[PDB]
């Protein structure tokens, strides 16, 4: 794995963690998943975690984090993966991402992207140039 990527993931890990313990909990991520315009219950909150959880404890630990990350870092057989990021980017649930919802998520995570950066990035998967990224456009970008 590229050191550059490692340093980048370091940033992500720094945003999910809010206790300084070094482990991803349900209470920490739940807070972010809340700022996304949603409100999940204990059943939903663990459902999301179970997706990453493979040990059976209900917590995003390091062992699962490595495998989980490898499952996306080199994801080119996107099955449920498409939906994951699609449901995180598509807040309206219409199936079309834009500088509308993307801006919100980019700011929610705390990445170094301005409003102009959002529109620019949006044209990476935007082939027709409609200002939105559809499922087809996303598939041919993530899987291909």
């Amino acid at each position: 794995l590229t050191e550059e990527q490692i340093a980048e993931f370091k940033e992500a890990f720094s945003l999910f963690d809010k206790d300084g313990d070094g482990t991803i909990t349900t209470k920490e991520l739940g807070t972010v998943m809340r700022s996304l315009g949603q409100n999940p219950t204990e059943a939903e909150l663990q459902d999301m975690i179970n997706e990453v959880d493979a040990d059976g404890n209900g917590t995003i630990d390091f062992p699962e984090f490595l495998t989980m990350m490898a499952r996306k870092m080199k994801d080119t057989d996107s099955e449920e993966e498409i939906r994951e990021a699609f449901r995180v980017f598509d807040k309206d649930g219409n199936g079309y991402i834009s500088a509308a919802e993307l801006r919100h998520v980019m700011t929610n995570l705390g990445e170094k992207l301005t409003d102009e950066e959002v529109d620019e990035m949006i044209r990476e998967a935007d082939i027709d140039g409609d200002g939105q990224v559809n499922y087809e456009e996303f598939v041919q970008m993530m899987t291909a």
Binding site: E84, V88, M142
Partner: peptide, 19 residues
């Protein structure tokens, strides 16, 4: 799901860095 969508977001945001 969550932390993984971040990895997906990073991949999608890393894919822009090409052309």
């Amino acid at each position: 799901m969550d932390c993984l969508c971040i990895v997906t977001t990073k991949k999608y945001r890393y894919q822009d860095e090409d052309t």
